[PDB]
Amino acid sequence: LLKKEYTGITYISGPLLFVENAKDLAYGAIVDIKDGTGRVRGGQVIEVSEEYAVIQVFEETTGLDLATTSVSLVEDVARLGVSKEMLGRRFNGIGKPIDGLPPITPEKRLPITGLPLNPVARRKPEQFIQTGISTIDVMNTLVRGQKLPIFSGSGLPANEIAAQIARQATVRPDLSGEGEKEEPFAVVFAAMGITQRELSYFIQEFERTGALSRSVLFLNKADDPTIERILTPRMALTVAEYLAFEHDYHVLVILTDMTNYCEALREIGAAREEIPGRRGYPGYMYTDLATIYERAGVVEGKKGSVTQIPILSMPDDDRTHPIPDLTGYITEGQIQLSRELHRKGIYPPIDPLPSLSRLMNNGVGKGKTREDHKQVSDQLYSAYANGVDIRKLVAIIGEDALTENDRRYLQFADAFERFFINQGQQNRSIEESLQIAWALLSMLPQGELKRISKDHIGKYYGQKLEEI
Amino acid sequence: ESAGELLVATARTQARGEVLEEVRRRVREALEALPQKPEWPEVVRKLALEALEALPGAKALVANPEDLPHLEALARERGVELQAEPALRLGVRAVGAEGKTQVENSLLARLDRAWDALSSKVAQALWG
Amino acid sequence: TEALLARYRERAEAEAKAVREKAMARLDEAVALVLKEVLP
Amino acid sequence: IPGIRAQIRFIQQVLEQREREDTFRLKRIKGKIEAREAEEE
Amino acid sequence: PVQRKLDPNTPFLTGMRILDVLFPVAMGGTAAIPGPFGAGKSVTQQSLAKWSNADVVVYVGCGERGNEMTDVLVEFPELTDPKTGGPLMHRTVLIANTSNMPVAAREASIYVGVTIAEYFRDQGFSVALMADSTSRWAEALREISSRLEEMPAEEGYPPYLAARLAAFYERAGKVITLGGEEGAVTIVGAVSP
Amino acid sequence: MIQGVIQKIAGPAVIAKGMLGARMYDICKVGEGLVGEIIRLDGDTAFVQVYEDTSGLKVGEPVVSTGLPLAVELGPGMLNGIYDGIQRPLERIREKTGIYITRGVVVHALDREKKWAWTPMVKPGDEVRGGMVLGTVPEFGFTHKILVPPDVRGRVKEVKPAGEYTVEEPVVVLEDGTELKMYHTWPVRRARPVQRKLDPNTPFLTGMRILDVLFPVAMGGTAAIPGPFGAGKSVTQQSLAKWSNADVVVYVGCGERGNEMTDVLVEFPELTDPKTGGPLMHRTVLIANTSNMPVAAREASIYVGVTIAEYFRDQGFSVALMADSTSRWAEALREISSRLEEMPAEEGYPPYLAARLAAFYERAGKVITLGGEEGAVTIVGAVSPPGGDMSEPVTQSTLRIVGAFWRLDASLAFRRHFPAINWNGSYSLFTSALDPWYRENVAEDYPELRDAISELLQREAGLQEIVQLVGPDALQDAERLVIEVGRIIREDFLQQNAYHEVDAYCSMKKAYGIMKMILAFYKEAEAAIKRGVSIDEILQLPVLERIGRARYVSEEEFPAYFEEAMKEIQGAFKALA
Numbered sequence A: 001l002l003k004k005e006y007t008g009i010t011y012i013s014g015p016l017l018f019v020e021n022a023k024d025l026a027y028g029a030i031v032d033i034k035d036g037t038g039r040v041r042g043g044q045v046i047e048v049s050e051e052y053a054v055i056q057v058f059e060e061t062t063g064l065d066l067a068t069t070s071v072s073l074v075e076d077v078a079r080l081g082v083s084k085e086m087l088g089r090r091f092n093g094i095g096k097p098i099d100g101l102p103p104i105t106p107e108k109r110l111p112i113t114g115l116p117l118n119p120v121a122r123r124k125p126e127q128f129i130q131t132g133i134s135t136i137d138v139m140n141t142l143v144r145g146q147k148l149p150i151f152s153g154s155g156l157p158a159n160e161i162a163a164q165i166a167r168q169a170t171v172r173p174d175l176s177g178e179g180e181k182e183e184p185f186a187v188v189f190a191a192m193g194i195t196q197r198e199l200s201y202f203i204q205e206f207e208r209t210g211a212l213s214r215s216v217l218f219l220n221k222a223d224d225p226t227i228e229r230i231l232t233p234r235m236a237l238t239v240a241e242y243l244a245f246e247h248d249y250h251v252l253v254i255l256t257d258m259t260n261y262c263e264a265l266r267e268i269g270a271a272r273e274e275i276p277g278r279r280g281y282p283g284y285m286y287t288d289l290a291t292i293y294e295r296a297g298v299v300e301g302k303k304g305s306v307t308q309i310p311i312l313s314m315p316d317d318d319r320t321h322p323i324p325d326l327t328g329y330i331t332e333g334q335i336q337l338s339r340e341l342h343r344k345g346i347y348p349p350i351d352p353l354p355s356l357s358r359l360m361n362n363g364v365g366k367g368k369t370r371e372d373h374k375q376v377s378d379q380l381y382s383a384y385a386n387g388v389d390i391r392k393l394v395a396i397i398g399e400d401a402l403t404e405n406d407r408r409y410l411q412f413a414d415a416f417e418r419f420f421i422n423q424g425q426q427n428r429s430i431e432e433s434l435q436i437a438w439a440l441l442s443m444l445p446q447g448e449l450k451r452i453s454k455d456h457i458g459k460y461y462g463q464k465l466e467e468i
Numbered sequence B: 001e002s003a004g005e006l007l008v009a010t011a012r013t014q015a016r017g018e019v020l021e022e023v024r025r026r027v028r029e030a031l032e033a034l035p036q037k038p039e040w041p042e043v044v045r046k047l048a049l050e051a052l053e054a055l056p057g058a059k060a061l062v063a064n065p066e067d068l069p070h071l072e073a074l075a076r077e078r079g080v081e082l083q084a085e086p087a088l089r090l091g092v093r094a095v096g097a098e099g100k101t102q103v104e105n106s107l108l109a110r111l112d113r114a115w116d117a118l119s120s121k122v123a124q125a126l127w128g
Numbered sequence C: 001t002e003a004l005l006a007r008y009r010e011r012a013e014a015e016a017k018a019v020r021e022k023a024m025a026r027l028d029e030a031v032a033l034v035l036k037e038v039l040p
Numbered sequence D: 001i002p003g004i005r006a007q008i009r010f011i012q013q014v015l016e017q018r019e020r021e022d023t024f025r026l027k028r029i030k031g032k033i034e035a036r037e038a039e040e041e
Numbered sequence E: 001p002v003q004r005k006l007d008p009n010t011p012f013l014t015g016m017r018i019l020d021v022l023f024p025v026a027m028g029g030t031a032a033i034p035g036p037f038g039a040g041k042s043v044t045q046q047s048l049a050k051w052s053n054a055d056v057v058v059y060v061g062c063g064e065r066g067n068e069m070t071d072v073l074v075e076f077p078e079l080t081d082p083k084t085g086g087p088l089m090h091r092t093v094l095i096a097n098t099s100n101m102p103v104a105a106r107e108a109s110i111y112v113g114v115t116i117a118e119y120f121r122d123q124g125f126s127v128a129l130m131a132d133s134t135s136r137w138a139e140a141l142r143e144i145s146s147r148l149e150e151m152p153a154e155e156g157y158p159p160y161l162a163a164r165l166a167a168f169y170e171r172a173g174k175v176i177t178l179g180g181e182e183g184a185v186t187i188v189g190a191v192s193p
Numbered sequence F: 001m002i003q004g005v006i007q008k009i010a011g012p013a014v015i016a017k018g019m020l021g022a023r024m025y026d027i028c029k030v031g032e033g034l035v036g037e038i039i040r041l042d043g044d045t046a047f048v049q050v051y052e053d054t055s056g057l058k059v060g061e062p063v064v065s066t067g068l069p070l071a072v073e074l075g076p077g078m079l080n081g082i083y084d085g086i087q088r089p090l091e092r093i094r095e096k097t098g099i100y101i102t103r104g105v106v107v108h109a110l111d112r113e114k115k116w117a118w119t120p121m122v123k124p125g126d127e128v129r130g131g132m133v134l135g136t137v138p139e140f141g142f143t144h145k146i147l148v149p150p151d152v153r154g155r156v157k158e159v160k161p162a163g164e165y166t167v168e169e170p171v172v173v174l175e176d177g178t179e180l181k182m183y184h185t186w187p188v189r190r191a192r193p194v195q196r197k198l199d200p201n202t203p204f205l206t207g208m209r210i211l212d213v214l215f216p217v218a219m220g221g222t223a224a225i226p227g228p229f230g231a232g233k234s235v236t237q238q239s240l241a242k243w244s245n246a247d248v249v250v251y252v253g254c255g256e257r258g259n260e261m262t263d264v265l266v267e268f269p270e271l272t273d274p275k276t277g278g279p280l281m282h283r284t285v286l287i288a289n290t291s292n293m294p295v296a297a298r299e300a301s302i303y304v305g306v307t308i309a310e311y312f313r314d315q316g317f318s319v320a321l322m323a324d325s326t327s328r329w330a331e332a333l334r335e336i337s338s339r340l341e342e343m344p345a346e347e348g349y350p351p352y353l354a355a356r357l358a359a360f361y362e363r364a365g366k367v368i369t370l371g372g373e374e375g376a377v378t379i380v381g382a383v384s385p386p387g388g389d390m391s392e393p394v395t396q397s398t399l400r401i402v403g404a405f406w407r408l409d410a411s412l413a414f415r416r417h418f419p420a421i422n423w424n425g426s427y428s429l430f431t432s433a434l435d436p437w438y439r440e441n442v443a444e445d446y447p448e449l450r451d452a453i454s455e456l457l458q459r460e461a462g463l464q465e466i467v468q469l470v471g472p473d474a475l476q477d478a479e480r481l482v483i484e485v486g487r488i489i490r491e492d493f494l495q496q497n498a499y500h501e502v503d504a505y506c507s508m509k510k511a512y513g514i515m516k517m518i519l520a521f522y523k524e525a526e527a528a529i530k531r532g533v534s535i536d537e538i539l540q541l542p543v544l545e546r547i548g549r550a551r552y553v554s555e556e557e558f559p560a561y562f563e564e565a566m567k568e569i570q571g572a573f574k575a576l577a
């Protein structure tokens, strides 16, 4: 094709510049800015009019001038270019390779914003995922096609939990009873605002256990331009959905820090001078977050699936901050970390009381897992709640007033936080997690387990202490 | 264990990249030999016609001084000013009426634009 | 048994040379095909 | 003490939001008066 | 238009003990259910749509998740209508406009739902209208106003939001239709502060 | 050369007409010529932000654009010097103008009159790439290497012979006509290119036992400290500068108050380099800004300092960079943002404060230079929020990207405990990466000893309620033993005198020996308690004096003392029976 250059530059200030004679530029197009020194920047058309078209520069505008600068059109819609050979590679936030390997050959080029999924074409998520963590596997079961963010703090180890989930994720098709062949499992890992230390830790974690073979990495650093932070989740989700819905893959998408993405969005919106929100964030933040989160799910008639585990840090542990508050309004639950358990040295420090999985009811039961899953989940939740109530009662009126049941529940809660949650680096299976759950459920009398049915009692109520 | 698999994968990737770059270099060198062909005036006139079609109302057309006599006849029929430029090799550029919009039509630019689209075809031709 | 990487290195060399030889068969055809598309 | 701290932070957030809204309205009126004085020619 | 508006004197049985006992709502009344995320607005509205004594149910997914609409589409044809034999999905009309769908269509979704409810009331039935989230409609209004560069009132919302909400909620009530028979519309709207 | 005239003056903002073709962020001379910066272009009009006072200017005065953005001069002559925020030597300014800094004065960062002993290391016809070494110049005991600018390629045509030359002498001429001098310019807002960035697997030895053991920082890492009054921050910083691994130290003031800056300026010249007899200033660069200096200098001082550090590590050294108060720099950034009428994000700060902080802090690291040699930058930036609240946005943004946090506390200094780092609040994230290095170079059991010491301190801190309610004498034998072991740890391992001749610096071996001695004594005391010995008898043993005097023992004579103390520890318990 041919090349068009626009040199009618009229006004440059901050991150914006105006081109006056560019009626041919479509809204939202991607352009290339070239200065007198030969350096080429990137830009996006955020507004087009007869008088001029407003272009937002990706990088800084240093070195631009009204005499020699020229603007050229790249493409009307932002296309990435994807192929099945991207597995095992390592790209930055913009999609260029960063591992030193030569560029890939694109099988197809797709828009990065994607399209909304027709609700008629969707289907209900039904199959569980074994994350290898007892608290997640038993009480907050993760289902294929779910968005399950993890809420963390400043010093809490979110990265370690994310890496552990990536390493230990399995589908367990044999438990489904159908005995079909194992489907391919892939991990798309998008990183935003990541320092060198975190990047090195992630690279070493992926290379140590060989998990990089079935994984694609989108790693955007902290010193990278701001706009690259915006595009990284869209590139990652485009690749994930392409693989899932054109190669029957089961894809797990992990986003390292949505707080950095929200900060970049706020900075860009302030640069464009939109209507402010609750804490300076743009008013359309909910829509922007939805356009990323809603891309996960399962589609009728296809075997692929997309699962998302966003990671974010709550500022000052404030659950009412706009970022976690708006994130919760979209996803199907949340996993919350506890600083008290971190001070106790528990790992992973997941607090089960404020955690919830909305799709757990459909992804567990007979055929999917062992048929006692829901009952034992309810029983452990009730017992832990009673233990916490006893703990709070002790901290006011003393230990003297405890009944034998109360102290039994107290010691059960202590053993629970010492064994069930504090698993360290164990890759506990669903069978092992259920065995441990039954083992400490035997600590209570048979008549005290009101939620569990009589069929499972005796069948599994072996009154056995923990073997670990 | 996975180290050997990664090594063979990167060996195959490097081989594919090297052969694709070899094809690209051969094509680029072949394009450099186009002006020596007898069809050079015809193809450059066609490129100038395409550029002028893509830019309605162009006030001028610029090209190579060697190629200027070739497009002199086309300049008269199209009724626009023409001028020479030594740096504009293997191409022709159209200048808009206001002088702020430019439309460029050159072999190297077309190759750079279409290489990404044609890479898949080249790969499937080389490896079946 | 730490010297098992030699087999993989030899396989990598052999497969690289095999890919080169296989792709060398249609080099001129590929060049002509892409030149036909690039040209008007 | 924690209840008082929560009330204090809530009040601070409310005041900051009101200040930001006032600043945005000031910028809006400045922009619109500039637009009027520019388009009046 | 309607002939006349009557006074509500019969309860809207939601099928839930606490709502039906402590805080009942009469046929033709309006109720609001605000709460933070995870409180259970959608589950409560689905339970209302599955067990209420309304002849026709209109469900409006104004800017909410698509999985919740998929769950309805999958499950409702299996259940049975309590008031009359046959699958429940023949009782329900769905207006689906998910979060990732265009923002400006949420207001149209709300108005289309309320108009369909009014029509089915005019046929003489007792219709229940459920709005999944009106906060998304308010956000769409705010965005459209911000494009117009109008003066915000507070938190960026347009000054006429209250008038729009009042006009939307006033459409409910037990009325005498122009055909000379009784019908009613009940509106239950969720808010997400 | 773009030239224009003043069209409109309003405060520090100057509008110039006829400036078509001016680049976006060039530096301009406004007036007869005050230094400014283009921030906006519109037709033939350019907006200039003048750094200094604009009173007295008139419409129609010339405006000249230099055609380059803000940049620093990198070359010999920077050591032992003091600069302002935009690299203007203060000594020559004082010589020229007196005690005041008159506006419009111009001086050169590098002295153009001094002569240096050139020593070529390249030959004619040799290809040269960006970052290669061209020669050698001695400077206060350092081997200052003249480096090719990173964006220069070519081959050498001629090279001057060894002799005396100034920094403006074109020592090497390339075959394309390019002339290479002893110095070059680099924009302060662009990071210098590197071949590769290495992983943090080597430690940054501070010389303080608490920082070197409990909260380590890797070579090329980032650390942050509070700055409360009365906590002895200045002496800690001076000890760090004296006893660090870094060959070159860069100090940035960035807008501190006048008297504190005066103290810093009068204290370093009196410091002595531990490695020689000369003062420490021969390997130190000072950047000083008072709170009444122009805001642009205060904002650009951080970038100037980090760029100088990047250049010095590109020469192949290890550099420690200390930002004195990033809160003042954040305040200056907020003021500049408010000058542009930008929308504040939270508590008045601009929405891009976190991005700027990350861009500054991410220049640190250990990298392979373009010349193939190893270098690193370690950044220790202090934050001093007003009121000491840690919820202030600058502190929150800083704690999300730093690798270490050494919480200085005034309470510890009040009870005469130094260097007064609170071990309850401090933390570090470089332990896991540094464990193999500790195993290789210190001892195979070093992580176990460190974890044991940390656990003992944690247990001691856990009992503080009871010892405060009922007193120490009401406890059992184990509790009293724990309290006394914690007291011994605090008084003999964490504590350190900076002014002491031999106690000022501690190697890893001495700290390991002290920790092992303390743990062995704790084990012996617990065994004696288990054997029915009274706590008072244990608290009166004579080997405790040997343990207490361990930190005052010379480094070379330490192993014999450690062996004798280890023998006495086992002798004192078993022989008494």
Ligand SMILES: Nc1ncnc2c1ncn2[C@@H]1O[C@H](COP(=O)(O)OP(=O)(O)OP(=O)(O)O)[C@@H](O)[C@H]1O
Residues within 6 Å of the ligand: A328, A329, A330, A357, A358, A359, E035, E036, E037, E038, E039, E040, E041, E042, E043, E044, E192
């Ligand atoms: N009556 C109920 N019985 C059992 N579980 C319930 C009930 N109501 C709510 N829940 C639980 O609460 C979860 C959250 O409910 P729901 O999704 O309806 O909340 P919401 O207020 O609509 O949320 P959002 O703000 O995210 O749209 C459900 O997935 C379910 O597990």
Ligand SMILES: [Mg+2]
Residues within 6 Å of the ligand: E041, E042, E043
């Ligand atoms: Mg809901």
